[PDB]
Amino acid sequence: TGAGTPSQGKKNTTTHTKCRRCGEKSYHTKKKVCSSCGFGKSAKRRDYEWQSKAGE
Amino acid sequence: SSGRFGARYGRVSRRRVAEIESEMNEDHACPNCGEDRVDRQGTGIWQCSYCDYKFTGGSYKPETPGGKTVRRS
Amino acid sequence: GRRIQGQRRGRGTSTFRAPSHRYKADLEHRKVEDGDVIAGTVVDIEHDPARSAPVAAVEFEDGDRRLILAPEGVGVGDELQVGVSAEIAPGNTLPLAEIPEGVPVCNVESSPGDGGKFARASGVNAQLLTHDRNVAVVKLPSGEMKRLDPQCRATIGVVAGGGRTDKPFVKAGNKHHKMKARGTKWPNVRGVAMNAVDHPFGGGGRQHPGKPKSISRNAPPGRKVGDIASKRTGRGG
RNA sequence: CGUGGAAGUCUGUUAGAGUUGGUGUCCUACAAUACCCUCUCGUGAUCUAUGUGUAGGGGUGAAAGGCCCAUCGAGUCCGGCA
RNA sequence: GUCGGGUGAGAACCCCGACGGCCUAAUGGAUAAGGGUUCCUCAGCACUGCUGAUCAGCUGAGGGUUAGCCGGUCCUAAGUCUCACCGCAACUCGACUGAGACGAAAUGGGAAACAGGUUAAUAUUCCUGUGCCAUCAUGCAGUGAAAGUUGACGCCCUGGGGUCGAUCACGCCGGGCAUCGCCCGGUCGAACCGUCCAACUCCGUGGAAGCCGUAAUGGCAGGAAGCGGACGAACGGCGGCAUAGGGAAACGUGAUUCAACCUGGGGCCCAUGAAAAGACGAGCAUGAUGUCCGUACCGAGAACCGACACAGGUGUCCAUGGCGGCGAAAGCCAAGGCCUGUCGGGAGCAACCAACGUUAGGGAAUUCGGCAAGUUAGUCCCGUACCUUCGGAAGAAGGGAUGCCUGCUCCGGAACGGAGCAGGUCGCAGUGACUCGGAAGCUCGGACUGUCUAGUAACAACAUAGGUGACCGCAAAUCCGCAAGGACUCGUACGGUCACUGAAUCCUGCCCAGUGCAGGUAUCUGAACACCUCGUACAAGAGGACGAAGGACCUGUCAACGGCGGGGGUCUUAAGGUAGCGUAGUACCUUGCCGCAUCAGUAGCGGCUUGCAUGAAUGGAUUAACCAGAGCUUCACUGUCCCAACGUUGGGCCCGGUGAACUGUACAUUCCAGUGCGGAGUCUGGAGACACCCAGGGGGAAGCAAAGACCCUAUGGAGCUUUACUGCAGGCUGUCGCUGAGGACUCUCACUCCGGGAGGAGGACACCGAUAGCCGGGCA
RNA sequence: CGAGUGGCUUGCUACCUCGAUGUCGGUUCCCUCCAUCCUGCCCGUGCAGAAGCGGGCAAGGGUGAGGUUGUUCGCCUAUUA
RNA sequence: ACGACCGUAUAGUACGAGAGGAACUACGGUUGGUGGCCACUGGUGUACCGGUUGUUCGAGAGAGCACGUGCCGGGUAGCCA
Ligand SMILES: [Cl-]
Ligand SMILES: [Cl-]
Ligand SMILES: [Cl-]
Ligand SMILES: [Cl-]
Ligand SMILES: [K+]
Ligand SMILES: [Mg+2]
Ligand SMILES: [Mg+2]
Ligand SMILES: [Mg+2]
Ligand SMILES: [Mg+2]
Ligand SMILES: [Mg+2]
Ligand SMILES: [Mg+2]
Ligand SMILES: [Mg+2]
Ligand SMILES: [Mg+2]
Ligand SMILES: [Mg+2]
Ligand SMILES: [Mg+2]
Ligand SMILES: [Mg+2]
Ligand SMILES: [Mg+2]
Ligand SMILES: [Mg+2]
Ligand SMILES: [Mg+2]
Ligand SMILES: [Mg+2]
Ligand SMILES: [Mg+2]
Ligand SMILES: [Mg+2]
Ligand SMILES: [Mg+2]
Ligand SMILES: [Mg+2]
Ligand SMILES: [Mg+2]
Ligand SMILES: [Mg+2]
Ligand SMILES: [Mg+2]
Ligand SMILES: [Mg+2]
Ligand SMILES: [Mg+2]
Ligand SMILES: [Mg+2]
Ligand SMILES: [Mg+2]
Ligand SMILES: [Mg+2]
Ligand SMILES: [Mg+2]
Ligand SMILES: [Mg+2]
Ligand SMILES: [Mg+2]
Ligand SMILES: [Mg+2]
Ligand SMILES: [Mg+2]
Ligand SMILES: [Mg+2]
Ligand SMILES: [Mg+2]
Ligand code: NA
Ligand code: NA
Ligand code: NA
Ligand code: NA
Ligand code: NA
Ligand code: NA
Ligand code: NA
Ligand code: NA
Ligand code: NA
Ligand code: NA
Ligand code: NA
Ligand code: NA
Ligand code: NA
Ligand code: NA
Ligand code: NA
Ligand code: NA
Ligand code: NA
Ligand SMILES: [Sr+2]
Ligand SMILES: [Sr+2]
Ligand SMILES: [Sr+2]
Ligand SMILES: [Sr+2]
Ligand SMILES: [Sr+2]
Ligand SMILES: [Sr+2]
Ligand SMILES: [Sr+2]
Ligand SMILES: [Sr+2]
Ligand SMILES: [Sr+2]
Ligand SMILES: [Sr+2]
Ligand SMILES: [Sr+2]
Ligand SMILES: [Sr+2]
Ligand SMILES: [Sr+2]
Ligand SMILES: [Sr+2]
Ligand SMILES: [Sr+2]
Ligand SMILES: [Sr+2]
Ligand SMILES: [Sr+2]
Ligand SMILES: [Sr+2]
Ligand SMILES: [Sr+2]
Ligand SMILES: [Sr+2]
Ligand SMILES: [Sr+2]
Ligand SMILES: [Sr+2]
Ligand SMILES: [Sr+2]
Ligand SMILES: [Sr+2]
Ligand SMILES: [Sr+2]
Ligand SMILES: [Sr+2]
Ligand SMILES: [Sr+2]
Ligand SMILES: [Sr+2]
Ligand SMILES: [Sr+2]
Ligand SMILES: [Sr+2]
Ligand SMILES: [Sr+2]
Ligand SMILES: [Sr+2]
Ligand SMILES: [Sr+2]
Ligand SMILES: [Sr+2]
Ligand SMILES: [Sr+2]
Ligand SMILES: [Sr+2]
Ligand SMILES: [Sr+2]
Ligand SMILES: [Sr+2]
Ligand SMILES: [Sr+2]
Ligand SMILES: [Sr+2]
Ligand SMILES: [Sr+2]
Ligand SMILES: [Sr+2]
Ligand SMILES: [Sr+2]
Ligand SMILES: [Sr+2]
């Protein structure tokens, strides 16, 4: 079976959903963690310096 | 008794299986009463179809060589 | 290279674990205060998923219901005893001191009160040899003479299920079913059948180990494969 | 002679799984792996849904350097970076 | 699809009727996920729709989803998280241990709802009727109440009970057809309450020494049959429910086979087949309460995923509609659905192409190769070789039969079940279509079923059982973690780890020199601390003494890595190739030589065999069975071929509509020669050449598509290797600290482990922290 | 021994092409060359004849089917002018 | 747009001791190639006619489907070798 089109048809699982904390559709309903803001992982908001150029 | 295996597995394998299973399926004298009514219930588990005595013994024999030694000493 | 299979093992992932949740009981010697006064009746005989051998369900006088590592010849209705002054009959458990020499024993303790360690597999047994005020010598199933504390408890008789090893698995399916009940990854791909990246014996245009198989005891994990610190190999000589 | 009904047992497009040949059709496709016929398995080391675990020099691997979201002899994203 | 017709400015494709078709595990019905309003109505056509559109999943506006008893909600599963504790430089990191919580919507467990009616759209939710559950309140009863039962369970075979459905018989209602008198549909009616009980278990009686019983196993003086009895089932029977409901009407009765559902018997395991909540145990009346969330629609060749109205992908239940037949098979047909796998019109419709039918004579001559195609075929009877692990081979092979009609026999309770008989009779053909093996032999490989390169490899590769070696007594061996800690392990040598070989059978020789591993070791070598000498008012430093693991040295070991020759009638370097097999999937020479087979055989097989460069768990030989594995031979068959023809369907061609892309320095009607950076439409010399258009098969544009994979180069990259260089983990070992009392020893008090504890074992060791030497492609 | 012609084999060279001029063998379809295998016409003969042998002119036409091998090449069989 | 071969007569002749054994010419045919044509033989012929299996239309009659003829038998014109 091809990893392409034929393997795409099984994708009917819900993972990322609207986050209660940040509003972004990144709250993984299985992991119960927001990939965007870290809700469910940390009290502090997810943020990284690599999200922008080093001089900014 | 290894006819279930057909022309597969070779002499030794199905020959020892037939033997082990033959002696396993033999009439066994119950330790409780005396009737040759002991049948295997599972791996190492035996029972008398007469008095209902359920007991432990060898995996395929109700009594093992080393098992008989126990009584003696 | 990549970590070898022996290294993935230690991580304790699902594939390498034993189906504990499917296991019945941690068959240990029942604890008794002192005096010995303790007996029970064999209520049933069950199959132990963890050892591929029978196990006796025993109900005690104080009302305690526990599975026991059954020796050969134990059946429903029988009365088992556990204590210093227990009867010297098969199925009973008492310290090595009270056990007469020359008598076959199983489920021996390593340190008094641990609940049993030695001789627990199908059909095996330890031979109680010497007595003393300080030490009781026992011959374990491997043939090793083991000096033990005479206070170490042990059960009389050989473990039930003897002869299990006599019948061949015959086919892969049978091995499959047994393996599924143990903490083991199966089947086994030969190292020599892998790529260099996957195992020290991998690679080559034909299958053969790189260097010799006998590896030093000091070898680090990832390299300790083949014949671990072998004192010799082969059959001749 | 009958009874019995065993089997990683046989036939089988039962369901289902797989994928030998045609080096057919297609090859700005219906399709970034498709179509047809043919063919293998089909009570078992079987197939399958859902839930769940293992994460990047790390997993997973009946081992093909296979697979880890069209990405693998070291995923992907952004950053180091002009 | 077609002919009529309807609406409309406009109709091939929007609607009605008729005729004609398509779908049958799905193209029907109910749903999970997922979508998210796509559902219904009205109004529309700028957009979307492979053409058009009056239509629409499109545009706009409105509307639509109603629950004590269907799900959720509750329970616990693999497992997840939180808090505490501990680690970490630290944390949003991290393992354990506690506590708490989370974790199942078709498809785990679970208190209780059925029937009908109703809307444009909901419906076990609304309405009508009937019923049921839980909690609580009051009244009565009851003092029992928690032991127990249940929830609650694997795989294979099978009996009995039994509903729906299907069919049969007969009756009644309605329809159809019209030479007959046959054919179709209907003939209804729940939850619930009450009642009945087979199987299993048990009791009394009885008293079998051979009887009782089964599909089968089986049962018995430890008490069989028989008789009586206790307990005891259906989603089943029976009565009510029901002068409920439903039907135009009748508004049946019996039977067979029996899904569901109920209840038993047998067999299997180196496999043992959840848990918890809850329920029962534990009465009755009357009344009250039963909140919160989901509920539309699609569920797919247009509502999901795949950029698309994508020929792909995507779970569940309907597996009992009719004929057919072994059948959930083919083929045909209902119910139900559809003509939207959504562009049409025209040309005996050319060439050419895709699918396909038939081809005389020959019959594999085709080709690397029977690739492709074809041949065979269902069922019964007869009959069946070598070989073999005695299972198999085997449907071997080969031979015969096969329909209809009339009348019957046998088995069985019977079937609308099965096996036969006699007579008659039709065709070229009776498994008449459909369904439906071609067969045989030799050789190689792997024993077998199984695995694999999702997307050029399915194989001889991997796995496997079997064989073997290694490590380890559990405070273990092996392995993960920086640590706290952890997998193996609810495990204990009949174990489990680490490796090799790869079923059976017959076997598995010689070599320990090198390398590896392990053991020993007089002596030699071997770091640091401490100690001693020199030196320095100290120190740097130099030397000495002692000396661990390791090395030298010695031994063991090849089912460890590997080796098994040259010469002469020993030498390198330990041995000097044993059984076997052999021109091999290993043999250069090579198409080796002889034979078989053929007209002819680099093939294939057998024999020989000096083997360039076979050979014994780097396993050797050999082998029944098995195989989408490699090679060869024969019979059969055939358009593979001689050698091609005709035909069928869809294209192609013409017309309406829709409407891309690749590609483009320029010029460009070329041809023959030459020249040129040596492979020119464009330069030179000639030749030819009126322009434009249609169809064609692809000769050229060193055609289009890709900054060559090959090769080299770069003081490029990466993966892999090792006795490359340099290091880093890790293991072993000494030393210092923790660390204490009386070159060997005793002890207990730190510390460690075992023990519920009391207490036991161990003990200044071990662990841990630090440093030193050794090993160290495990890693950088 | 000496002199050459060809450009089919092999070698040499590194001019051309590495922002690609698709391999060998085969097949199918077309054109050509002559150093002629057959066929026409000739000369010589160790030419009686028949059958040959050697040579000349000559490219109109022909030069086929099969067994092993991927083979080109070649070996083999039976036909053949 | 025609190439080549075989056969008969010449002839058992010339030649030759014999064995063996020609030619000119005239005829008949074959093979390869070429162009055309279909009376004849052959193929096709999902035009047509018949037989017949399963199922559906109640039987009969007469029809549909079984892949673009269910299968089997025969086969006109045309097109063809
Ligand atoms: Cl095992
Ligand atoms: Cl629901
Ligand atoms: Cl029964
Ligand atoms: Cl010939
Ligand atoms: K090039
Ligand atoms: Mg235990
Ligand atoms: Mg073993
Ligand atoms: Mg497992
Ligand atoms: Mg293996
Ligand atoms: Mg490999
Ligand atoms: Mg490789
Ligand atoms: Mg390596
Ligand atoms: Mg090998
Ligand atoms: Mg090997
Ligand atoms: Mg899963
Ligand atoms: Mg409308
Ligand atoms: Mg609706
Ligand atoms: Mg469509
Ligand atoms: Mg023919
Ligand atoms: Mg040929
Ligand atoms: Mg074929
Ligand atoms: Mg009868
Ligand atoms: Mg061969
Ligand atoms: Mg195989
Ligand atoms: Mg592949
Ligand atoms: Mg395959
Ligand atoms: Mg093994
Ligand atoms: Mg083994
Ligand atoms: Mg192998
Ligand atoms: Mg040979
Ligand atoms: Mg050997
Ligand atoms: Mg380049
Ligand atoms: Mg290269
Ligand atoms: Mg590099
Ligand atoms: Mg502890
Ligand atoms: Mg490296
Ligand atoms: Mg080209
Ligand atoms: Mg000439
Ligand atoms: Mg010419
Ligand atoms: Na029998
Ligand atoms: Na295929
Ligand atoms: Na990585
Ligand atoms: Na349309
Ligand atoms: Na009832
Ligand atoms: Na049927
Ligand atoms: Na199989
Ligand atoms: Na050696
Ligand atoms: Na060798
Ligand atoms: Na297979
Ligand atoms: Na044909
Ligand atoms: Na062209
Ligand atoms: Na690389
Ligand atoms: Na020349
Ligand atoms: Na070629
Ligand atoms: Na010529
Ligand atoms: Na040839
Ligand atoms: Sr899915
Ligand atoms: Sr978290
Ligand atoms: Sr931050
Ligand atoms: Sr334990
Ligand atoms: Sr314990
Ligand atoms: Sr290797
Ligand atoms: Sr030996
Ligand atoms: Sr099978
Ligand atoms: Sr292929
Ligand atoms: Sr196509
Ligand atoms: Sr393709
Ligand atoms: Sr085909
Ligand atoms: Sr099959
Ligand atoms: Sr960058
Ligand atoms: Sr318009
Ligand atoms: Sr609609
Ligand atoms: Sr919950
Ligand atoms: Sr449920
Ligand atoms: Sr099942
Ligand atoms: Sr029945
Ligand atoms: Sr609905
Ligand atoms: Sr549906
Ligand atoms: Sr589909
Ligand atoms: Sr597919
Ligand atoms: Sr219908
Ligand atoms: Sr349309
Ligand atoms: Sr015909
Ligand atoms: Sr052939
Ligand atoms: Sr041939
Ligand atoms: Sr026959
Ligand atoms: Sr072998
Ligand atoms: Sr696969
Ligand atoms: Sr063997
Ligand atoms: Sr050695
Ligand atoms: Sr020899
Ligand atoms: Sr010019
Ligand atoms: Sr064209
Ligand atoms: Sr010339
Ligand atoms: Sr000539
Ligand atoms: Sr060549
Ligand atoms: Sr050659
Ligand atoms: Sr003549
Ligand atoms: Sr003569
Ligand atoms: Sr038809």
UniProtKB/Swiss-Prot annotation, chain A:
Any single GO BP term: translation
SUPFAM superfamilies assigned to the protein according to its UniProt record, in alphabetical order: Zn-binding ribosomal proteins
Pfam families linked: Ribosomal_L37e (PF01907)
InterPro entries: Ribosomal_eL37 (IPR001569), Ribosomal_eL37/eL43 (IPR011331), Ribosomal_eL37_CS (IPR018267), Ribosomal_zn-bd (IPR011332)
Cofactor descriptive note: Binds 1 zinc ion per subunit.
Zinc finger (C4-type): 19-37
Keywords per UniProt: Metal-binding, Ribonucleoprotein, Ribosomal protein, RNA-binding, rRNA-binding, Zinc, Zinc-finger
Molecular-function GO term, any one: rRNA binding
Subunit organization: Part of the 50S ribosomal subunit. Interacts weakly with protein L4.
Role description: Binds to the 23S rRNA.
Protein name per Swiss-Prot or TrEMBL: Large ribosomal subunit protein eL37
Swiss-Prot record, chain C:
Hydrolase listed as a keyword: no
Record GO biological process: cytoplasmic translation
A single MF term (Gene Ontology): rRNA binding
Alphabetical list of SMART domains matching this protein: Ribosomal_L2, Ribosomal_L2_C
Cellular component aspect of the GO annotation: cytosolic large ribosomal subunit
Pfam families attached to this UniProt entry: Ribosomal_L2, Ribosomal_L2_C
Alphabetical list of PROSITE patterns matching this protein: RIBOSOMAL_L2 (PS00467)
Outcome of swapping H199 to A/G: No incorporation into translating E.coli polysomes; ribosomes assemble normally. Significantly reduced translational activity
Region ranges (Disordered): 199-237
Key words of the record: Ribonucleoprotein, Ribosomal protein, RNA-binding, rRNA-binding
Note: This protein can be partially incorporated into E.coli polysomes in vivo, indicating it can replace the endogenous protein.
Binding partners and assembly: Part of the 50S ribosomal subunit. Forms a bridge to the 30S subunit in the 70S ribosome. Interacts weakly with protein L37Ae.
NCBIfam families: PRK09612.1
Official protein name in the record: Large ribosomal subunit protein uL2
Phylogenetic classification of the source organism: Archaea, Methanobacteriati, Methanobacteriota, Stenosarchaea group, Halobacteria
